Amino acid sequence: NIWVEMITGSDLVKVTNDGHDVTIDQLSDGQRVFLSLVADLARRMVMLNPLLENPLEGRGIVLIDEIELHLHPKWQQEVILNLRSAFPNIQFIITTHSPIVLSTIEKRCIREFEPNDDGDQSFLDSPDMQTKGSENAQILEQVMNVHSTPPGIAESHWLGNFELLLLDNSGELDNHSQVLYDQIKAHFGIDSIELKKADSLIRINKMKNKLNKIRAE
Amino acid sequence: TKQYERKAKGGNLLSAFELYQRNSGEWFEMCRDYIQDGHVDESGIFRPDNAFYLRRLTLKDFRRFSLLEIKLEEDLTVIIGNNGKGKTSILYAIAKTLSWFVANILKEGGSGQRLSEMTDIKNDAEDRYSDVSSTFFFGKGLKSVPIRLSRSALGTAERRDSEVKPAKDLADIWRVINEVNTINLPTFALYNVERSQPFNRNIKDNTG
Amino acid sequence: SWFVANILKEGGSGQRLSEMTDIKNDAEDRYSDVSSTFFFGKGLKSVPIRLSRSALGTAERRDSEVKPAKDLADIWRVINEVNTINLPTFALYNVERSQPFNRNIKDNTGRREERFDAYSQTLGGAGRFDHFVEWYIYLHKRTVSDISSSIKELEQQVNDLQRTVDGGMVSVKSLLEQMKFKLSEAIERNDAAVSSRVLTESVQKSIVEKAICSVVPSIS
């Protein structure tokens, strides 16, 4: 909710934010900046489209740089849908760094720089992968060329190394593989995704080896 | 003229408007209907018969770009890349172009914005000038509205001219038709990273 | 303002009418005009100027018509550049002229001595009484000082420095060049002052003092 109070003796705009009545000055920077964008745009559309039953269905072109600016991931998952629903005839031209935002948008809408461009590329193109409805981890790797784990942390490589060790020792848990397993367990914990993946690798490799022995006999 | 009459009766907006200006009823109504006609779709949303959008953008020796072409979607286009790939540059280029429509809707022969002679020409460009070329669409009666903003580097003797007359011509139609009988007008807005400002309730604008 | 701007600078712009405050609120035509006609002898009986402004979004612009004012101001400017002539004074004194006096008077940068400082803030409404005080003190200091004594002193210093460089002290050549530049500047200013055909500071002082004493009854 949003309303004007005059009763203190000065004109104050108030809002109900997360169930609490607050002044605009009490809003977080993220909320205020986003409110400002929508308020301004709505004002202009109302003023310029007096003959439409819904003035927000007017024509125009709106440019927004870094749409995810100050937005929590939760909000990033709704922002484009809400904007397009409120302003259905505007052409939006947007920039983003957010895989979460990209997960809500069709690949045809996306224009993507080649990674090693150096400013001689002639035409921009859409990504190969469909982004709308895709997992964020996939968008990061396939579209944004960013690894799922931070490369400058040693622990980020342990599960990969563990897998390689298993494959090098014909699928058996050797002294070296056991040490690394224990390190993974100690660092990430007993119910970590990483450990479960390691456990899975052990189980599948044991079963593959059993098959191989049966075939040899 | 008979030529303009034929084109106008074929549905060309510019011809209809030219005939209106020379004979200053029928032609006025044509122009106003072109702008105002539309329908409500199955979802209950009003849709103009003649949509307005940016179709294509070309950048030549502009900032990082030696020569770049972008085809835009009618509804939503999202530009992605690492920092320093020129995403902001693209939006700046468009906003400057749109400034020419806004200036001419406000005032006959109004001046839009310009490319910077200090910053906007590519640093290692052999020709020392930059071009921002845009093509806009306004229904099947005005399929192409081409605009070019140009600028030569500081201290170059040869100066490169912008071509903005098509923007002015379209904006004139909106302005003049509106003056006679109210119409709905297009919204143009840019929200860059400067939108993150501290709020002050007290500082009030006395400029209009 | 349009005459002043163009006397000062070729292509100078005067002041424009405001779209917000200057246009009548219920004007059917949605524009405002201020039309003035000036006279300059029998050779130029009519100098028309129009300042105009239209409301936002009107179908037609209303532009100002200022060329005659600019043409006349150009005559004054160009002829003056070749050979010094007398120039017209333009001034506005509003109720703003009633304001307290800051005693704490500013150091002579040297802007107040320039002839066309006479056009500075001339149509602002308050005058610049502070500029008068600075200028008047300046005039006094120059009157008490000897004329070209600094030049004579500088001439003597450049001659002494030239003798030192001729005596084999090459280290002071940089200082000599600086002092020669200062001397040349002083002579040029003196020559420009001489070239500008301007009244002596003593005479200027006298004229102003007499004016003040004549017009202001309590001041003798």
Next chain:
Amino acid sequence: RREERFDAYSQTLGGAGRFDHFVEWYIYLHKRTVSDISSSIKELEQQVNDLQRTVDGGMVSVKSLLEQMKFKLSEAIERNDAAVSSRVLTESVQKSIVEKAICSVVPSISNIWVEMITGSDLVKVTNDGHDVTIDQLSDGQRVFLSLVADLARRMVMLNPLLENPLEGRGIVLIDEIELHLHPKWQQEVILNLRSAFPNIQFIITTHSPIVLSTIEKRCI
């Protein structure tokens, strides 16, 4: 005022830094590196000696100039002594430290330097292999450069006795560390900051899971 040690505390808790103060200070450092103060003292000492010889030779007109030059020499020695007395890192070393810090922490920047272009000092950077002005940097690059540059300047000024002044003590607060950063940069930013400023207590806020992937849960 930018050379004064306690300028490091100017507007430290205002929220923006003072990147403009950095630029001024950095240009200043460059000018002093290209022109050492002792040669100026030696040159000034030589000029004072030459002027003293002229005064001893009977040219009393240059006595005023000698007194001025002696004053300038004394001031230069005092500044040199104060600089000496402050036991401070040389201007060359200070410049080098800051340059290294910036290039190490800011991934797109490989080099930073001051050019004299036309008649004005300009800071230039090699950004993504291309030489550009600061004003040509992207907002993300500039914002991050600003943070690191400002912090490094302050640390150099406040820690003159350390071999590496960036190993000084302090508390730094950063709101929304991921502001304007691409995911690729978010994976490096905390590691780079902690490596460059090892003894600073960082208290930071973030909305980025990519940033959190580089941090231990105890810090969250």
Next chain:
Amino acid sequence: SVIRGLAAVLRQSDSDISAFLVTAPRKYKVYKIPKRTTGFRVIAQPAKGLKDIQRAFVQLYSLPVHDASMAYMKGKGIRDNAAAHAGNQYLLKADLEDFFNSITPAIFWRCIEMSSAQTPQFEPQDKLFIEKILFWQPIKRRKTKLILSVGAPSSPVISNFCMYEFDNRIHAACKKVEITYTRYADDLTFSSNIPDVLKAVPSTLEVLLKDLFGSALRLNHSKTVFSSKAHNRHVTGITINNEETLSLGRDRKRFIKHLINQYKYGLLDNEDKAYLIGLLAFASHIEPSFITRMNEKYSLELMERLRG
């Protein structure tokens, strides 16, 4: 020598030709022609005396012209130009900026010097007269700016000649990669059945233009357009349909039918009637099958009455 040749052709004295040529670059009438939408084009036509000289010059001196040049060529036109591309599925169009006004005496003489095919040899004394014959001085006060004007009768020939070497090189390059190339004045058209070969052509053009003309002649990047059978294809006002045939286009055909229907009911005014007749002549040239269909639709008698 040029003077003597012209004098002979025009049956005038050497002296009167020479005297006329002294101020020939200024002997142009300037006027405006309305564009089909909003605005005007500015045209500069030489005075009658100068036109005669220009025509005589072109008669006396044959300059080489490439076969890919379709404009201003005897026995060729827009039909031939369009037909060259009708069999190919992919199309590229490029346009040169300020084409005629970009051609200066310097460019002309450079082309003469460079030319491979047998160019006329001019005496140095004649060079000044030739410049005065062929080039217009737009600015009275600036004697140094001479340019070709579209409105002059010599400008077509000179422009085609100046593009001769350009056409040679690009034609040869295109032929190696199975691209069809034609030029109609400032309009360049490229077509192919091979996907993705056309993408390289614009870059090739820029390099070649720079090589031959430096910065004098440039591509209009806003007028570079790719098309295919997925989209509308036209070449110099002629539509190429998906059956690989030349067409007037559906909209023009429907307009003509409208006019014929109006004529059938005696509703066309004389001006519109004359217009209709002219358009049918053009239609007969581009799409004779359309005329056959109209004859079938409207009665041969009606159509003959109209065309008689």
Next chain:
RNA sequence: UAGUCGGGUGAUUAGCCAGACUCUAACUUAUUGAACGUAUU
């Protein structure tokens, strides 16, 4: 799906009907001059 091509109908630049096409991807242009088509002779 959309856009495009266009054989037919239709007091006809509309609308409707039929069939087809799809390199990331047409935006229909300019005269009195030049060339081409038609008319005139």
